[PDB]
Amino acid sequence: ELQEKLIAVNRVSKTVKGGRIFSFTALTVVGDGNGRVGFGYGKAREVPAAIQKAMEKARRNMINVALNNGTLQHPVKGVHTGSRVFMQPASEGTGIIAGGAMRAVLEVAGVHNVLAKAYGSTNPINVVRATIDGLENMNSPEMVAAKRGK
């Protein structure tokens, strides 16, 4: 019962010698509703073939996000070249008021109380890369309680 979505695309088609060339790309996210989120890229000679190749890569493992219960307990750094980025939990009761530019990557797991819109860049790639590569850097309750105990 995994959930499977696009986010972004290119027009990617230029002049040459010689006439014009074109391509078909995709940036997609997948997840599993108990807490697991992931992401994958692709390309083809054709539209859905690129989406296919992209989602097939997105189906890889999916990071179990530290949720307790409907949303998550630390601002884990999504570190990139300035995105910064962080998200902010809301008090488990009001919705996913996140940036529609990157909301996908948390609605594929049904994370119901997290907000923050597109902080330092007007580009959905900038934040969607920044997040998954910094979500792997999360800590469990039992890990923050070893870090401040044993």
Added chain:
RNA sequence: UGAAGAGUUUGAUCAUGGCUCAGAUUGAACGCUGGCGGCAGGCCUAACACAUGCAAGUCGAACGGUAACAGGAAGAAGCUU
């Protein structure tokens, strides 16, 4: 419970990024309308000018007496006895 951007300069992209944002809401105002109360507003643009009505009068119980009327009494009469 505090936080969904996005049509262009491209011939395709990531940063620099004036602005329209999907209406903030005034001692705010206007056009073409006429089911409706209510709270509250009374000429910002020439502190320029003008009909007309008037913007503290009560009072004598406060020094010398006193005005039309409501009352009385004389003197004069009207015939109203």
